[PDB]
Amino acid sequence: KTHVQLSLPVLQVRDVLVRGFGDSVEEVLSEARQHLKDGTCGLVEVEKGVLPQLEQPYVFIKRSDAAPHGHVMVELVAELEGIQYGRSGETLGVLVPHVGEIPVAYRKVLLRK
């Protein structure tokens, strides 16, 4: 399927134990996609002081469309040193590995896979 319904656990930035997906734009996008498929991907909502506490390159989910079954349509965009690789809508948050942190909420998304 070109799209997959996921429920992403929303983590508090200070709880996150693994703060990025790797060391290159291509690796973080690869790893983000693998974790999303394996249900081991968390979401951190971006506010002031969140991103400096995570590791670059960042992986964002961004709104790709204006929401089937409550799931917002999203796609992946990486950022490294202020350059983004991909073009999409509003940031829903930054993806991180999930390794058993307790979530504060769930974000229903439809991921363009």
From Swiss-Prot:
<feature type="domain" description="CoV Nsp1 globular">
    <location>
        <begin position="2"/>
        <end position="113"/>
    </location>
</feature>
<feature type="region of interest" description="Disordered">
    <location>
        <begin position="1"/>
        <end position="113"/>
    </location>
</feature>
<protein>
    <recommendedName>
        <fullName>Host translation inhibitor nsp1</fullName>
    </recommendedName>
</protein>
<comment type="function">
    <text>Inhibits host translation by associating with the open head conformation of the 40S subunit. The C-terminus binds to and obstructs ribosomal mRNA entry tunnel. Thereby inhibits antiviral response triggered by innate immunity or interferons. The nsp1-40S ribosome complex further induces an endonucleolytic cleavage near the 5'UTR of host mRNAs, targeting them for degradation. This inhibits the integrated stress response (ISR) in the infected cell by preventing EIF2S1/eIF2-alpha phosphorylation upstream of stress granule formation and depletes host G3BP1.</text>
</comment>
